[PDB]
């Protein structure tokens, strides 16, 4: 009646589509972006960590963030109307209400886009591989921004939206979990560099086996969008690659599926890796190495250097990185290379 | 580090795959060309991180 | 070990060029994934639902 | 038994055999370091 | 130092049973026809 009217007004063709997914996607995405943009502009983090992170306080674009809540909030969501600000907007901004605001509204914007991709694919009449492929960034998002702080004691250890605050996350993860020495991260890095490797090489091969159909040196003008005749010699690409490297694709369908497969799996394996850290289960040691370095003090490996360096990262970043513990270390118990 | 602290990077002297490495040339050797025949013995060519230079020049 | 000493002595993360390098790798990986999905989702019907889709291409 | 027309063979080939062996082997080499600890 | 002899068995089975699984799958379909 009115339902099929609401249907065909939404599912209609326009300069940019909306659909049923539009109803969830657009408010959530727009609020999350808008929140980050006002947070980086006016909002302090001086009542939480003792930082300044906004243009109003005098910070540049490389040092701003919408910073996390305080440690004493636990895992509270900090709702505007709730009994931690009691209907008050100023305190709600100071206590970090914008971080959770942005995080939840962005979490629903991701589901909106995911659904939007499904809907447009069902409409156009193609297979939905692009929506299955898009579950890797949502896996990463909910493993790093949601599951990891929910395994810890607060939102305080989650990464803050900002570039330098993510850099501090990199150093924190390296320092306290030795994150590069965990095999799931090895697999994620490999998967991602292999995605990057396939990108350059596939482009370079297709663009350097093109047929003559133009008049000018540029061959960008020899293309019509129809698929009636082939646009690059696949046979030649195979013959080339089987001879310079040893193995080659001889199946386009499989080549493009390999391109889908490598980085999405990489990110999935890394998502399993960071949920493993949320319980503080962390690959940090090989027991055989400790017992050996215990019985022989003139044994050295690069791994032992890395653990001494991890000591340096932790002991020197802990004071201003965990102010809620009110840590005070004397200057004589800080670790030093020259004291060894 | 040219002050008599060796580093083990070989599997047979108690490393696994993750910790193993070919350990760079010595700080005492510098930017010098250091093949097998510019050393007094193979023993001390290996002691100064000899194979490191030998892999990388050919590889590049 | 190399990365960690490199970061300490020069702070490579605040160098704008390293930031373009990670953008290129993240974007390269990203364009690979979406290129793969868009092409494999547009394939023609020469198959059935008991034999893989990849036997629609007969070579060359 | 009684014939069932729904039953069908499985098809595995030489290239997929190589890919599978390579994946199991590089996985083996990566995780032995942690299993031995 | 230490080697863990249950870790030995752990890799040994990990690399055997799927290689054996794959080698049987590949051999029975190539031993049949056209």
């Amino acid at each position: 009646g009115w339902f099929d009217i609401l249907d065909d007004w939404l599912k209609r063709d326009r300069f940019v589509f909306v659909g049923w997914s539009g109803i969830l996607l657009f408010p959530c995405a727009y609020l999350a972006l808008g929140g980050w943009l006002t947070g980086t502009t006016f909002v302090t983090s001086w009542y939480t960590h003792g930082l300044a992170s906004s243009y109003l306080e005098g910070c540049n674009f490389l040092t701003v963030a919408v910073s996390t809540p305080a440690n004493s909030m636990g895992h509270s969501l900090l709702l505007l109307w709730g009994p931690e600000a009691q209907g008050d907007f100023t305190r709600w901004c100071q206590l970090g209400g914008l971080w959770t605001f942005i995080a939840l509204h962005g979490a629903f914007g991701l589901i909106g886009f995911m659904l939007r991709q499904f809907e447009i694919a069902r409409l156009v009449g193609v297979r939905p591989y692009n929506a299955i492929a898009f579950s890797a960034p949502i896996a990463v998002f909910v493993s790093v921004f949601l599951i990891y702080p929910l395994g810890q004691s607060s939102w305080f250890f989650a990464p803050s939206f900002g570039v330098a605050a993510i850099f501090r996350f990199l150093l924190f993860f390296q320092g306290f979990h030795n994150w590069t020495l965990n095999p799931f991260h090895m697999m994620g890095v490999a998967g991602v560099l292999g995605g990057a490797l396939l990108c350059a090489i596939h482009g370079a091969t297709v663009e350097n086996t093109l047929f003559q159909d133009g008049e000018g040196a540029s061959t960008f003008r020899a293309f019509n969008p129809t698929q009636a005749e082939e646009t690059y010699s696949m046979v030649t690409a195979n013959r080339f690659w089987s001879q310079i490297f040893g193995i080659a694709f001889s199946n386009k369908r499989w080549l493009h599926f390999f391109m889908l497969f490598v980085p999405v799996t990489g990110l999935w394996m890394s998502a399993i890796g960071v949920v493993g850290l949320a319980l503080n289960l962390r690959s940090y040691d090989f027991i055989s190495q400790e017992i050996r370095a215990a019985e022989d003090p003139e044994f050295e490996t690069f791994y032992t250097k890395n653990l001494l360096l991890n000591e340096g990262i932790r002991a020197w970043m802990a004071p201003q990185d965990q102010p809620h513990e009110n840590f005070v270390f004397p200057e004589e118990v800080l670790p030093r290379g020259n004291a060894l | 580090d040219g002050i008599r602290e060796p580093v083990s990077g070989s599997l047979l002297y108690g490393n696994n795959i993750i910790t193993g490495a070919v350990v760079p040339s010595s700080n005492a050797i510098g930017l010098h060309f250091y093949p097998i025949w510019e050393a007094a013995s193979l023993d001390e060519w290996l002691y100064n991180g000899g194979p490191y230079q030998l892999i990388i020049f050919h590889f590049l | 070990n190399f990365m960690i000493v490199f970061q300490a002595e020069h702070n490579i993360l605040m160098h704008p060029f390293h930031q373009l390098g990670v953008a290129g790798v993240f974007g390269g990986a990203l364009f690979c994934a979406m290129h793969g999905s868009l092409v494999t989702s547009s394939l023609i019907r020469e198959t059935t639902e008991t034999e893989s889709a990849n036997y629609g291409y007969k070579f060359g | 038994m009684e014939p069932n027309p729904n039953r069908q063979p499985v098809e595995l080939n030489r290239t997929s055999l190589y890919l599978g062996l390579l994946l199991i082997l590089v996985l083996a080499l990566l995780f032995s370091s942690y299993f031995f600890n | 130092m230490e080697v863990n002899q249950l870790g030995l068995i752990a890799t040994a089975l990990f690399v055997l049973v799927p290689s054996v699984f794959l080698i049987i799958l590949y051999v029975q379909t190539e031993s049949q026809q056209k």
Binding site: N238, G246 | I17 | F59 | - | -
Partner: peptide, 30 residues
């Protein structure tokens, strides 16, 4: 004990390269 397991796996991987290159399934145009 540990070194043998490692090198056996590396040896299997390079033998696989040889077999995969010189005893492949020949891709042929139709």
């Amino acid at each position: 004990m540990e070194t043998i397991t490692y090198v056996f796996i590396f040896a299997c991987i390079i033998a696989l390269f040889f077999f995969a290159i010189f005893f492949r399934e020949p891709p042929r145009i139709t």
